[PDB]
């Protein structure tokens, strides 16, 4: 299991070449801190693929979702968040929007996103899994470890 | 009277063509949730017109103010907010800025805006009432119903 | 000593030509309100110069740091913030990013910045002191007085 560590401490440990994400995210989950092995999904205003991924058991994993930063539909709501938590995921990093914000703060999982929108995403299943996602100058690679807190996100 | 309903539930009810506003607003009022018939005012760094509108009795109405999103002056402060609350308005959606943020959280009315600025708006009265206002892909039409919560805004 | 006053009240006192900053900052410190004589430092992803400035005794001063608004490195963390507080500074206005957000809320000093990033700044000492800094339509001049609260910042 991966033990969480403040991003600032990781930076002190890693040095000048630390992989720190510059993108400013908002916190939505019941946990402000989380760390775990990275899994990825790229999609667009559709969440059937990411939901299937989060349906699988996870050893405290972190799912990075690249929804092109769209604020038009909610990629994650309280249904998918609870599902993720129930299967073992420790955190979700959403390059897009979420819904049920009031409820998300009450789910024991980390959740970062750019904003909110009650409009639902489609469920065609379109998208790609296990791809590399580059956000804020950092590339999220499947298998690498993500650490997230109020300061930012570090990938090791 | 219009009974509030979470925007996410309205979306579930309405379907894919739901009129959901994509613009990200900050919450400032004592109420995080509100719903009511829409009234509108378009102006620019001037709030004499919107104040006169909010001076009239309202059956739990919602005033949508298009101030072109300016963050230069406060369209609404604790004086106008309290006035609105005292005359029956349930919520104010400000496409601009507000002042007295610390006090606004203590006024029993919903308030959304893009930001804050202590600089005051002028009081010439310039502007237009009852016009259609399109923000974040949604057109706020006088008479339609607005629902607002932590996720967004729905117009029915 | 300078006694704090709400920015809205200062605006009422000063009138239409009040110097009010339009730039939207996030609050990070233990104090949401502060006021004091202005000192300045311009730098870029380097904080050795501003740290030396904050190392000097201050009569409740306010340090305005222009880091070009970079969100790539933290200009101020809990070490520099505590140092500033320990030497007498009442507030820091950072046109850039900070780190140790969770800890900053527990330091008795005002702190405003554009965002966060755990990545550290360099310590070459590069930069300029006592320069005029113009942000959001307001010029921060050394010697002038800055007042900061939840609504904005006024310079007198």
UniProtKB/Swiss-Prot annotation, chains A, B, C:
GO biological process, one term: regulation of RNA metabolic process
Cofactor(s) for this UniProt protein: a divalent metal cation
Record carries keyword Transmembrane helix: no
GO molecular function: 4-hydroxy-4-methyl-2-oxoglutarate aldolase activity; metal ion binding; oxaloacetate decarboxylase activity; ribonuclease inhibitor activity
This protein's record includes keyword Metal-binding: yes
InterPro entries: RraA, RraA/RraA-like, RraA/RraA-like_sf
General function of this protein: Catalyzes the aldol cleavage of 4-hydroxy-4-methyl-2-oxoglutarate (HMG) into 2 molecules of pyruvate. Also contains a secondary oxaloacetate (OAA) decarboxylase activity due to the common pyruvate enolate transition state formed following C-C bond cleavage in the retro-aldol and decarboxylation reactions.
This enzyme's EC code(s): 4.1.3.17, 4.1.1.112
Note accompanying the cofactor annotation: Divalent metal cation.
Catalysis performed (reactions): 4-hydroxy-4-methyl-2-oxoglutarate = 2 pyruvate; oxaloacetate + H(+) = pyruvate + CO2
Keywords from the UniProt entry: Lyase, Metal-binding
Binding residue positions for a divalent metal cation: 100
Pfam families per record: RraA-like
UniProt subunit comment: Homotrimer.
Protein name (record): Putative 4-hydroxy-4-methyl-2-oxoglutarate aldolase
Binding site for substrate: 77-80, 99
Additional remark text: Was identified as a high-confidence drug target.
Family per record: Belongs to the class II aldolase/RraA-like family.
């Amino acid at each position: 299991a991966i033990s969480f560590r403040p991003t600032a401490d990781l930076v002190d440990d890693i040095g000048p070449d630390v992989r720190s994400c510059d993108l400013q995210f908002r916190q939505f989950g019941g946990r402000s801190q989380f760390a775990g092995p990275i899994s990825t999904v790229r999609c667009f205003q559709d969440n059937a693929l990411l939901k299937s991924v989060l349906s699988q058991p996870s050893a405290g994993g972190v799912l990075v979702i690249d929804g092109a930063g769209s604020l038009h539909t909610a990629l994650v709501g309280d249904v998918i968040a609870e599902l993720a938590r129930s299967t073992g995921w420790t955190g979700l990093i959403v390059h897009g929007a979420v819904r049920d914000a009031a409820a998300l703060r009450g789910i024991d999982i980390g959740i970062k996103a750019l904003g909110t929108n009650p409009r639902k995403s489609t469920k065609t299943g379109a998208g790609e899994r296990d791809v590399e996602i580059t956000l804020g100058g950092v590339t999220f690679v499947p298998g690498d470890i993500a650490y997230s807190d109020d300061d930012g996100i570090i990938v090791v």
